Write a protein that binds this ligand. Structure first.
Ligand SMILES: C/C=C/C(=O)SCCNC(=O)CCNC(=O)[C@@H](O)C(C)(C)COP(=O)(O)OP(=O)(O)OC[C@H]1O[C@@H](n2cnc3c(N)ncnc32)[C@H](O)[C@@H]1OP(=O)(O)O
Ligand SMILES: [Zn+2]
Lengths: 274, 27
């Protein structure tokens, strides 16, 4: 059974089982091309593949570019093999992913960091081309070697940027995992406190906040509740602009600017597909 | 277009379309 993966210069311990063919699954280690995501049995077979493989980045269209950070839009119908390999790779670190074969109804947004050898996988999120429940993310993953550096929140922010340009309100697919929920709550906290910091008016509706942020009204209310900013005072519902929360937020978003871990809306070059 | 869950042991029901008043510390 697969315990480790060789991925570029990294050796990654796998967390959950992924349904690779038994010919590959019975081996202890899998070697993968870091650009095309094809999986191989040995270091020797990988070396020979890397000499021949023409891919230095994901397929599809580069829709975001800020220096070394890119996002590629990959259509599951146009690049089926790449997207299946990506889903099999994702399933090694995602427990609850249940889709690896029929990738045709999905778009995959693949974030990369460039160096002099090519554009290296940071993480991704998948998205239904047409979601009945208006889900703007299906699954989301930061690769283990990049985790806890701010890239997950960049991916989340990017998913809402797409929703903003589409003139839609979005939400992640249910159910949300433990780590997913922690990440989304941090993001929703940031966006809400940003809005209220910049808003000068005397009142605001949840719908107005939802329209500007592309965040679902239920998620806004949930976040308002989590921050204890919804109060009651003689008959009416009231948004409490908490002192301590906005102070710490400015200190936090100073650090966010310093480390460059932000998605810049002006660096998106995108019109919705089809 | 409503939502519910308790605030300080009191179950409440909030509209998403109505303007909600924004407050600082106060009383
Ligand atoms: C709709 C869903 C379909 C799916 O099932 S998707 C499931 C969501 N994806 C997953 O669960 C896959 C596994 N992981 C990912 O891809 C996850 O990393 C992830 C994609 C979330 C998050 O990836 P990142 O680690 O790159 O996220 P950030 O570095 O941006 O951190 C975000 C936020 O979560 C915090 N965080 C991140 N990891 C941890 C931990 N470990 N413990 C405590 N706190 C954590 C973190 O500190 C942050 O909060 P603040 O400090 O308050 O700003
Ligand atoms: Zn390759």
């Amino acid at each position: 059974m697969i315990k480790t993966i060789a991925f570029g210069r990294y050796e990654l311990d796998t967390w959950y089982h992924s349904p690779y063919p038994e010919e590959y699954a019975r081996l202890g280690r899998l070697y993968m091309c870091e650009f095309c995501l094809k999986y191989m049995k040995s270091q020797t077979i990988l070396r020979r593949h890397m000499a021949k493989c023409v891919w230095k980045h994901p397929p599809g269209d580069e829709i975001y570019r800020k220096g070394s950070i890119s996002v590629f839009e990959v259509d599951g119908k146009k690049n089926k093999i790449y997207c299946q390999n990506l889903c099999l790779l994702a399933k090694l670190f995602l427990d609850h992913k249940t889709l690896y074969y029929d990738v045709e109804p999905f778009l995959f947004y693949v974030m990369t960091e460039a160096d002099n050898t090519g554009c290296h996988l940071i993480g991704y999120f998948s998205k239904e081309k047409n979601s009945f429940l208006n889900y703007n993310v299906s699954c989301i993953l930061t690769m283990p070697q990049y985790m806890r550096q701010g890239y997950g929140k960049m991916l989340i922010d990017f998913s809402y940027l797409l929703s903003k340009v589409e003139e839609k309100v979005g939400s992640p697919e249910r159910p949300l995992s433990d780590l997913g929920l922690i990440s989304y709550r941090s993001y929703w906290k940031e966006v809400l406190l940003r809005y209220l910091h910049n808003f000068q008016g005397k009142e605001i509706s949840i719908k107005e906040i939802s329209q500007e942020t592309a965040v679902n009204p239920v998620d806004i209310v949930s976040t308002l509740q989590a921050l204890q900013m919804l109060k009651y005072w003689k008959g009416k519902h009231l948004v409490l602009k908490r002192q301590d929360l906005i102070d710490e937020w400015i200190a936090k978003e100073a650090k966010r600017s310093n480390s460059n871990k932000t998605m810049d809306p002006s660096c998106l070059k995108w019109t919705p597909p089809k | 277009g409503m939502v519910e869950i308790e605030i300080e042991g009191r179950l409440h029901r909030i509209s998403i379309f109505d303007p909600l008043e924004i407050i600082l510390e106060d009383d």
